[PDB]
Curated annotation (Swiss-Prot), chain A:
The keyword Acetylation does not apply. Component of the large ribosomal subunit. The ribosome is a large ribonucleoprotein complex responsible for the synthesis of proteins in the cell. Belongs to the eukaryotic ribosomal protein eL43 family. Component of the large ribosomal subunit. GO terms for biological process: translation. It holds the Pfam family Ribosomal_L37ae. Keywords: Cytoplasm, Metal-binding, Ribonucleoprotein, Ribosomal protein, Zinc, Zinc-finger. One of its GO terms (molecular function) is structural constituent of ribosome. This is Large ribosomal subunit protein eL43. GO terms for cellular component: cytosolic large ribosomal subunit.
UniProtKB/Swiss-Prot annotation, chain B:
It comes from Oryctolagus cuniculus (Rabbit). Gene3D superfamilies: 6.20.340.10, 6.20.370.70. One of its GO terms (biological process) is translation. PROSITE patterns: RIBOSOMAL_L34E. Disulfide bonds: none annotated. Component of the large ribosomal subunit. Component of the large ribosomal subunit. The ribosome is a large ribonucleoprotein complex responsible for the synthesis of proteins in the cell. This is Large ribosomal subunit protein eL34. Pfam families: Ribosomal_L34e (PF01199). The modification Phosphoserine is found at residue 11. There is a cross-link at residue 107 (Glycyl lysine isopeptide (Lys-Gly) (interchain with G-Cter in SUMO2)). Keywords: Acetylation, Cytoplasm, Endoplasmic reticulum, Isopeptide bond, Phosphoprotein, Ribonucleoprotein, Ribosomal protein, Ubl conjugation. It is found in: Cytoplasm, Cytosol; Cytoplasm; Endoplasmic reticulum. GO terms for cellular component: cytosol; endoplasmic reticulum; ribonucleoprotein complex; ribosome.
Length: 91, 114
RNA sequence: UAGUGACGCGCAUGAAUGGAUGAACGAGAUUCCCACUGUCCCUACCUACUAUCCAGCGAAACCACAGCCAAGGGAACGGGCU
RNA sequence: GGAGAAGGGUUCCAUGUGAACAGCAGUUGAACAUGGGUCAGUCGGUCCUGAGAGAUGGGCGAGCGCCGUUCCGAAGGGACGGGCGAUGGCCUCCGUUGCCCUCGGCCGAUCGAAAGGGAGUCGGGUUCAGAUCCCCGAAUCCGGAGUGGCGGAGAUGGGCGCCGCGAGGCGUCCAGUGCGGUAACGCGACCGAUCCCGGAGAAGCCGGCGGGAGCCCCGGGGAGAGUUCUCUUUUCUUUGUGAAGGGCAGGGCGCCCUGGAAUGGGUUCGCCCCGAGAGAGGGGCCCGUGCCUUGGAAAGCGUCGCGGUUCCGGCGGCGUCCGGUGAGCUCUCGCUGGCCCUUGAAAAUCCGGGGGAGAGGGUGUAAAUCUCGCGCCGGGCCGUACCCAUAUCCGCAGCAGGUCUCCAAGGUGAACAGCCUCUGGCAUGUUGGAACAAUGUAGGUAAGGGAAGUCGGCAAGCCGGAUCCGUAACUUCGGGAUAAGGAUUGGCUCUAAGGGCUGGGUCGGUCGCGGCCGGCGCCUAGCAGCCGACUUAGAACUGGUGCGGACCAGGGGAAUCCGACUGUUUAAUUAAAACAAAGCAUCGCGAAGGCCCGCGGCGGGUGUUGACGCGAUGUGAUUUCUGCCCAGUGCUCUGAAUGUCAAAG
RNA sequence: AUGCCUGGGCAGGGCGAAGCCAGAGGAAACUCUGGUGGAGGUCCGUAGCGGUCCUGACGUGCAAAUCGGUCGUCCGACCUG
């Protein structure tokens, strides 16, 4: 609450588009423009390049992830279920 | 202050119509048309963002005139792949082949056991 | 007889044929106030270009015939008739 | 003002006439009549492909033809290596052609950009009109090069047995498709096919910073010059070097070697980086459009003086010099970031790499040189004048309309705003003279009142820049906001604050003011010298209260209705509440499918698509809510329990 | 008029979103102050694009739709060959 009270990133939109829409898009913007930690090099340089495309500055590795977040909950659940099914099948 | 004009019939400031200022022995400023800036070859590995060293950055058709020495470097995969990538390739090939030999020996031992 | 605020008795209001509200915005439609001023009381004066006259150059629209009025009668409002 | 693209097509240049035209005139013209003028391997077409167009095969169609561009195709006529046969040329040696074996993906013929991609030329001079095209002088690209024209690289190593004092010579065995550096990589070269891999070509918009150049600015030297009634070491103009090579500054590196860091460090305007190796040292690579040099002072320019009646592209003396600055403008190069439910071209063409199918001569030679340095020959065809716009184009015309770009000085000023000026350009826009009547068109000023005028403050006026204070209701908390409301602004003379570069290693010894050696002072509270850009604040004095003195340049407040907003709309009467818009809610479709085109086809679009998609509707930001009714008209579901129900049987 | 391909262009200022730095308070959660930063289908405004009002000029006009002032927008659903 240094410069703005309760808008933060959506301060660029001004008074337009409605309060609820700006509040809804605030979390999406924060997740989209956040830099994540790459689980290949250990550095916090994972940045979103395009929709579902995440790139590491150091590793130079591109990872196919979510649209606005590096990992979606559905993808993690599917990965866990696939690992469980593989362990049940191959044994 | 002297003002100058294009010396060709192309009046539009396109990519092919780039000029620079030059002073002639006649003490007048004229337009000299410049060649496009060349780029050094990129490594064949595709992971290194930098461009390869030891090769002149000229237009692709200029390489026909350029000698062989300026177009590559005195290494394996010289002028197409970086030294770091080549070293990684050497180590990876040796380690993978050694692991294959170990796996083959283990499989032969398993065959002999049964 | 304008505007705003309340009432509902609503010829013929009304809920995505959307109702109510609503910050910012609008060469959108209205009311009042401050300042301002020739909009006005009540008009005047000044400047430039025209209009004016001259040298030269020079059309178009229109044209039954033409062109002073009162009354009368008449196709019930005439330049013509008395 | 100087040059282009489309368009025009002789309008361009010289001479002559004034019949007609240029709404007056004309000795003038873009009029008329004679002639003249456009010079290319390097500038573009030509080459490539893009969106797309369009043959063959195939299908349809009564038919001219149409569908479609890989789909219902025996779709490459090419190449290397080997063999045979034939001719030609000193049938030695090679070329050509024919046959046989062998090898072989492409992806649709073809067209499609004078602004996309695309190797390679500049300087001076020169015409009445053309010159990166002509001449002079310097280069460069591509192709050919057989008999290779030359040199150079593959190159002239060792061992052994002899001879000779030695240098060296002879015979034999071989090696010899290069060399250097730990490394990045470098050296003028430095075999190689079918095949495979990669790169370049080949990429969006915006912000910030840094380097280079052009221009502008300041302090000077010269040369030519306006003023000089007073002053002014005066003000005005000029004061340089091409492409292509070599060398060196200057930038960048996500390149390498030593080493391992918390007391975390390095560092930018911002960022950012570091045990996956940061600071500190030593190297390497790329761009070098900048500086020096060949080019090149011979030429160009400014001056002073001449040869020659004239023609005459001449002859000569001089100079073309030394420095500093700037969030300054433009171009370019390079780093660094921000935005996308937007990710921002293809092909021609060129190059590097992985492999070793094969070749070479055998110990002085050869096969090879993605040719190392020179040397020889050629580069065909088309366009090239001029205007490019208040007169060479389109509007019936020399029409206040329309029509795509590049170059961009000084002052004031935030500014590419407005105003004045320099280089350059012109005559005021199809005529001039004489007066200043009324009505006009375009500007203004008006005592007192201040909207009493009018449907309506229509029109005009008021405020206006910058600095210092201050700023309400409401609100989606972002705004409102320059809210509203106040004070200052000139000129002159000062004060204070905001920075860089260099300098001490001084003493003694030694060597030739400089270099080396040792301990000293280590300025570690820093000072001395020299430079340079603009700013901010404060103070005094002063003018008839004048000072954003011209120009530039918001009138505000309280409310109602509508549309969330940004955006779009009836070219030529309606810019709005209309349309659109994100949000919200329904409908259909799992591919022989939904929606749609099509006379036609195994046709086509969505679809290079797959329910977070495509297609069809309604409403229209945020908040709240979305009441009841299936009687009617629609839509939809199943149903041999079925009344009516055509053809055929 | 719309879609696609390939090119070109858009002065000078205001407001000040993320992110970052320093100081202060706190037991923590964290909160204030001063800076840096330059985002926005942001604002004033030129070029460009368009055409609200004067229902001005003109209305056998410069013009079979032009002209003057005043205007909307001017980094994006932008303008244009
Ligand atoms: Mg081109
Ligand atoms: Mg009233
Ligand atoms: Mg009703
Ligand atoms: Mg209704
Ligand atoms: Mg009559
Ligand atoms: Mg001109
Ligand atoms: Mg002429
Ligand atoms: Mg005449
Ligand atoms: Mg073509
Ligand atoms: Mg380092
Ligand atoms: Mg020409
Ligand atoms: Mg004229
Ligand atoms: Mg005049
Ligand atoms: Mg005149
Ligand atoms: Mg008065
Ligand atoms: Mg008004
Ligand atoms: Mg207000
Ligand atoms: Mg109300
Ligand atoms: Mg609207
Ligand atoms: Mg209209
Ligand atoms: Mg209108
Ligand atoms: Mg509905
Ligand atoms: Mg029903
Ligand atoms: Mg009118
Ligand atoms: Mg009239
Ligand atoms: Zn990583
Ligand atoms: Zn690499």
């Amino acid at each position: 609450a240094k410069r703005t009270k309760k808008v933060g990133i959506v301060g660029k939109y001004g008074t337009r588009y409605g309060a609820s829409l700006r509040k809804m898009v605030k979390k999406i913007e924060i997740s989209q423009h956040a830099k994540y930690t790459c689980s290949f090099c250990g550095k916090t340089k994972m940045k979103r390049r395009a929709v579902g495309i995440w790139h590491c500055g150091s590793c130079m590795k591109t990872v196919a992830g979510g649209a606005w977040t590096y990992n979606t909950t559905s993808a993690v659940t599917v990965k866990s279920a696939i690992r469980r099914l593989k362990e049940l099948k191959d044994q | 202050v002297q003002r100058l004009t294009y010396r060709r019939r192309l009046s539009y400031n396109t990519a092919s119509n780039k000029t620079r200022l030059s002073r002639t022995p006649g003490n007048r400023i004229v337009y000299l048309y410049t060649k496009k800036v060349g780029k050094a070859p990129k490594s064949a590995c595709g992971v290194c963002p930098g461009r390869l060293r030891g090769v002149r950055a000229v237009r692709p058709k200029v390489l026909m005139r350029l000698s062989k020495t300026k177009k590559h470097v005195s290494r394996a995969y010289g002028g197409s792949m970086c030294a770091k990538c080549v070293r990684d390739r050497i180590k990876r090939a040796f380690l993978i082949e050694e692991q294959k030999i170990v796996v083959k020996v283990l499989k032969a031992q398993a065959q002999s056991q049964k």
